[PDB]
Design an enzyme around this catalytic site. Structure first.
Site, mmCIF file in Angstrom:
data_model
loop_
_atom_site.group_PDB
_atom_site.id
_atom_site.type_symbol
_atom_site.label_atom_id
_atom_site.label_comp_id
_atom_site.label_asym_id
_atom_site.label_seq_id
_atom_site.Cartn_x
_atom_site.Cartn_y
_atom_site.Cartn_z
ATOM 1 C CE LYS A 80 -7.168 6.647 0.829
ATOM 2 N NZ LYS A 80 -8.424 7.663 0.070
ATOM 3 C CE1 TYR A 87 -4.454 -0.949 0.301
ATOM 4 C CE2 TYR A 87 -4.201 1.515 0.065
ATOM 5 C CZ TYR A 87 -5.307 -0.100 -0.176
ATOM 6 O OH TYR A 87 -6.307 0.010 -0.130
#
Ligand SMILES: NC(=O)c1ccc[n+]([C@@H]2O[C@H](COP(=O)([O-])OP(=O)(O)OC[C@H]3O[C@@H](n4cnc5c(N)ncnc54)[C@H](OP(=O)(O)O)[C@@H]3O)[C@@H](O)[C@H]2O)c1
Lengths: 247, 245, 242, 255
Positions: free
Chosen positions: C164, C157
């Site tokens: 995020k 990720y």
């Protein structure tokens, strides 16, 4: 070189059964740093082993105390008061859940087992903190032991996870209430030291690619109680090789 | 328009003693959505109060059960089974701590006060969840109530904070264990329903009972079919703040 | 029967490029509830795709704006003002990280890739919030999409997880600053939308696009009027697992 | 008596501009423990300030590097390699956000101010970590500094809070990636302490708040942060990685 000198400090470690106990590990480091340590064992079955641990620490004072028995706890901190005068460090290394509750599903946990587990593993911290409060000196400290399952679901840890959740919340409130009088309260969230499936998975998943050791928990316990952690209270510190940060 | 149609759905709401409770607000909203509700009450001396609550909901079944008594919980769930056939929703709004435990310091909590607080406030969720499991249909759900004091120290909350911490961890494990059979378990972390909250909270006001009711409704409804094991905050944003303003 | 009636409400949905996106799902639900929707699209070469999305929503306004260009964002909000008068809802579904950043280790992320990822994925929320603020009516709301990699390490990720984390912290600060004017700001932490997730999650399945849509609708609706500064998980319980 | 003997250990400390910083405190403690330290400084106009810091540490190597310049970071790590052979510790105490971003509301942060704050305060950790990786020995470690505003809203902290949130997530991912080679990565979440704190306009309302609200009823000292930095880098913390540890007198546990 920096030195951690705990000469003249007084320590009570509750929750000792074998040399592989996390409680003993903290005690070993505390004695190594120059503290006077006392140990407390649960029942008469373990006195022999308790005496062997005292020997490994190069001598240690022993008490028997069952944390479910208020009378026995009263006797313990009376013995401590007589034997030490005051207290600096209290290690809380006690946990228990009935075997019947540690198998199967948490939802099937029986009333008397659930409460017993919360009594021994969580309330006992409140019980011993109240009795130690008038004995504890400035810079004094209480440290307990917990595990990740309090925050995330680890299957088969069942009611103990809940107990730890109650334990950690206790730590924060006790930290708030004993802070003014110069007493710190923290928790060590150890990794593993039903079990082997968790143990072999931490090694693979954890950032360090191994499990933590008994000594690594001891070292953290020593630091937290030492004046090197004088600004640290109400914390849950993880010694788990980084396992809990993994998604 | 999107509609929330809960007709044909059966709900059991526990721990509601007054119309100004958060548990009542959830029941009201479920009733508004079309569900049939059954209220539990602790003891027969409280039947008149329970009857007023049933009337205020526009009709509701009543059952007597003390949540510390396993026998009575077996009886209540037998009565719910006979009356409903099955169950869709269970609202757990039971919260209690002895008066002596709530006065003074947490460290001074007596052994049996502490255990009782945890018994009524946390274990009861496990006790009702086990008995509800065989009755619960697919898409069914359990919701309980909690507060911010579980995570952060709120003075004078004492053992309730601990009980709530135990409660939220229970929610997680129950969500895991009841999940495979299509049952969701969630917690609502409600703000107080007080002076300092309105000054500090992002919305600059306290939340209402109806706002908790709406979240309860949502979480139990099919609109939240992907949501389980969660603690959702309805506190006007208060808990995100790092300072008192 | 409780009804969610959003007729007369105006929504701006940003970051939608396909119908199988989570941002589209929210728009669909908003439209179903009665709101008028305006979609943004990045560049004029993407207008055909944007028109298809408008048609799928059963009609929607289109505006061109690249979220890295402040001028275009001013133009988009001027256009939205002209066409709607005000604004009720803003759905932020913008997420991007260069392909080189997402291949390999996070520690090997290049400076310009890392900055770009955070610009498009996190700063864009600040940029569109500032411009939406004077348009936003009482009871109005902003909602964004995030993932659990922000809190826990999900390998591969990389920088998106960091973006995020930056996004969610922004959500809290924006909630605080836009709150007094009756605007709420929240994040939806979605699970993936379809194999191992299905094995670990309490519900023993993955979530659907519609489930994210429903939460988006709820959070923006008056039913969530007491909820702000939150990160709500729609992940079939997955993230609670140790 | 337990001793922390760090002689023979090599440390790189980055982002220290004053003796009253948290980064300096860590460096001092490492020096006290027996390690050799190298200080980085941003630009050659700051060499006199850097020399004063080196002297205050009782001697330290100096290297010039601006953390926004990849070429200079290559040069610094080449210089560190030549002078030390390898590395044991890296202290990341770099934190910057432009003055305009820290004045007013977070929602008003300009694009390039926001990006710069994140570049200097968060990305720099990734940048220095990549270059430190081949130099870092087993038992080696990286430590950085953060604060509570990352998780909870502290007004007037603005983009720094966001940067700190990006920083802590970076610490987690870096701990996972550098772990197999025996390198630990951790963050220290320090309570308010009275230079780099002067660039934060919401610091003092929090400083006064902590002494009244915190469980210990006082603020923490620079030495207390120093001690934790030393602990985390020392072999005593060999089981600890990916962590954010709070030295804040208990403040952040309060509701
Ligand atoms: N070992 C791990 O993998 C691990 C990981 C994370 C956290 N922890 C925590 O670390 C702490 C120490 O446990 P451990 O793992 O090192 O094992 P341990 O020391 O052997 O067991 C905990 C101690 O608590 C005592 N105890 C149980 N019930 C008691 C009672 N009613 N009254 C007085 N004492 C009682 C036990 O005595 P008896 O043996 O006679 O019952 C034992 O000495 C525990 O709190 C545990 O939850 C352990």
């Amino acid at each position: 070189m920096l030195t951690v000198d705990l000469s003249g400090k007084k320590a009570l470690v509750m929750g000792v059964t074998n040399q592989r106990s996390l409680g003993f590990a903290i005690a070993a480091k505390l004695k190594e740093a120059g503290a006077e340590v006392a140990l407390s064992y649960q029942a008469e079955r373990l006195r022999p082993e308790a005496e062997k641990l005292a020997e490994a620490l190069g001598g240690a004072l022993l008490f028997r105390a069952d944390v479910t028995q208020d009378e026995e706890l009263d006797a313990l901190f009376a013995g401590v008061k007589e034997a030490f005068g005051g207290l600096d460090y209290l290690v809380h290394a006690i946990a228990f859940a009935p075997r019947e509750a540690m198998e199967g599903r948490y939802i099937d946990t029986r009333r008397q087992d659930w409460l017993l587990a919360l009594e021994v593993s969580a309330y006992s911290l409140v019980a011993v903190a109240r009795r130690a409060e008038p004995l504890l000196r400035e810079g004094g400290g209480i440290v307990t032991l917990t595990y990740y399952a309090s925050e995330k679901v680890v299957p088969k840890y069942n009611v103990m996870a809940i107990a730890k959740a109650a334990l950690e919340a206790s730590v924060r409130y006790l930290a708030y209430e004993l802070g003014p009088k110069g007493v710190r309260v923290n928790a060590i969230s150890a990794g593993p030291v039903g079990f082997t499936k968790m143990y072999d998975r931490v090694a693979q998943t954890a950032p360090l690619r191994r499990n933590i050791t008994q000594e690594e928990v001891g070292n953290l316990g020593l630091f937290l109680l030492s004046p090197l952690a004088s600004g640290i209270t109400g914390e849950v510190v993880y010694v788990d090789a980084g396992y809990h940060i993994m998604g």
